[PDB]
Design a protein around this ligand. Structure first.
Ligand SMILES: Nc1ncnc2c1ncn2[C@@H]1O[C@H](COP(=O)(O)OP(=O)(O)O)[C@@H](O)[C@H]1O
Ligand SMILES: Nc1ncnc2c1ncn2[C@@H]1O[C@H](COP(=O)(O)OP(=O)(O)O)[C@@H](O)[C@H]1O
Ligand SMILES: Nc1ncnc2c1ncn2[C@@H]1O[C@H](COP(=O)(O)OS(=O)(=O)O)[C@@H](O)[C@H]1O
Ligand SMILES: Nc1ncnc2c1ncn2[C@@H]1O[C@H](COP(=O)(O)OS(=O)(=O)O)[C@@H](O)[C@H]1O
Lengths: 193, 193
């Protein structure tokens, strides 16, 4: 069946709006918080969606991947292909992964734009020194202590987005305020009516 | 957000009905035909769904897998995890893969029933001699000729389902008739109202 027919039966608000909102950023930058609140926002506004994150991907589909650069590349590649299917199905697919390599984020975008599906890269941008100081899950302490090897920002590279569709300054917005900025982008791009 | 809230915004017909319809069977048994017509049927009845098949999975997510037993196991494992996400999102996920190994089909089921998501194994059951004689894509000729190695039914095993939820005798039903049997199962299980 065609995408337009999907858009008729997916959700109450007519129109096909499948797409992928690709969050990227350091550990503790707020990706989980923003993605969960974005999901709540969309559902409350009648827009079916689904979130892919480390919790539901790296314990399942990607349980056989570590954090070597090669495994992060394959992690993101698989996530991009799954997000493309969710977008093709008519859902707003929100992805919440560190995704530290420019090439793999751009490969994820190419998979979508080849299939003529919208792809929005959102750089969840908090300074590393802020993420370390808050250390919301204690991970940065263990990384400095050597108990987690190759942790992004400490012993593994994060390549900052140079051309995201949106930059979220999460040391300066509360959850709902950063969500409002994502909603504005989705309205501009005719995802959210 | 919860599954019940998803069921409110996914589709027009209220109620959460996410699940996976897992087709299994020999090449040429009719999996593609039945899955595509099932998708058409559900969409026409206002039920959002999505089909995973060799066309959209083995050229994308699973492009790095062959047909060794080990690669078929990983192929099915990844597909099962993706189907579980689609079911969790509230969609009827139709899968259309040979899935020749009992253990991997049962592992796929366990992934779903652990997450309390319904899983319906449909054995698309045509005799191998029938599939060979029709040879709808010419594949069986190339398998006998040695141009495709380890082709299911010729140089690779198909373990017949012993406990499917439904057996589809596709040498004896036309497309719509086999679809009607799947619809009956989904009605019995409160997926289709
Ligand atoms: N001053 C603030 N008040 C409320 N929420 C905030 C504030 N600053 C950031 N956030 C939100 O908190 C999450 C993490 O922000 P961060 O500054 O990394 O940690 P923390 O919020 O614990 O200070 C992000 O989703 C962000 O949107
Ligand atoms: N007598 C029939 N008339 C119409 N469709 C059929 C008939 N027998 C099978 N089918 C459908 O054709 C597809 C493949 O059936 P199969 O017998 O393997 O090949 P073929 O249909 O070319 O004879 C299946 O989806 C099945 O539902
Ligand atoms: N070495 C690590 N580097 C970054 N995150 C890690 C590492 N080890 C475990 N984690 C974590 O695994 C999740 C990050 O995974 P991803 O977002 O999937 O990373 S990515 O680089 O491959 O995109 C977080 O739960 C998290 O803190
Ligand atoms: N050696 C093969 N055995 C079975 N199918 C093959 C083989 N090589 C290519 N194909 C095909 O690949 C698809 C079957 O793939 P799957 O359904 O994904 O198989 S499975 O065994 O791993 O579940 C069909 O398009 C098809 O005919």
């Amino acid at each position: 069946v065609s995408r337009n027919k999907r858009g008729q039966v997916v959700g109450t608000r007519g129109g096909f709006r499948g797409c992928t909102v690709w969050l990227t950023g350091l550990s503790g930058a707020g990706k989980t918080t923003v993605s969960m609140a974005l999901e709540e926002y969309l559902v409350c506004h009648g827009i079916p969606c689904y979130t892919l994150d480390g919790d539901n991907i790296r314990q399942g589909l990607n349980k056989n991947l570590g954090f070597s650069p090669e495994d992060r590349e394959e992690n993101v590649r698989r996530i991009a292909e799954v997000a493309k299917l969710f977008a093709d199905a008519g859902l707003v697919c929100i992805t919440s992964f560190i995704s530290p390599y420019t090439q793999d984020r751009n490969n994820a975008r190419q998979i979508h734009e080849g299939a003529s599906l919208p792809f929005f890269e959102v750089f969840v941008d908090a300074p590393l020194h802020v993420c370390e100081q808050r250390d919301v899950k204690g991970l940065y302490k263990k990384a400095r202590a050597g108990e987690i090897k190759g942790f992004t920002g400490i012993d593994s590279d994060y390549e900052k987005p140079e051309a995201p569709e949106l930059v979220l300054k999460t040391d300066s917005c509360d959850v709902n305020d950063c969500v409002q900025q994502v909603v504005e982008l989705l309205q501009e791009r005719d995802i959210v009516p």
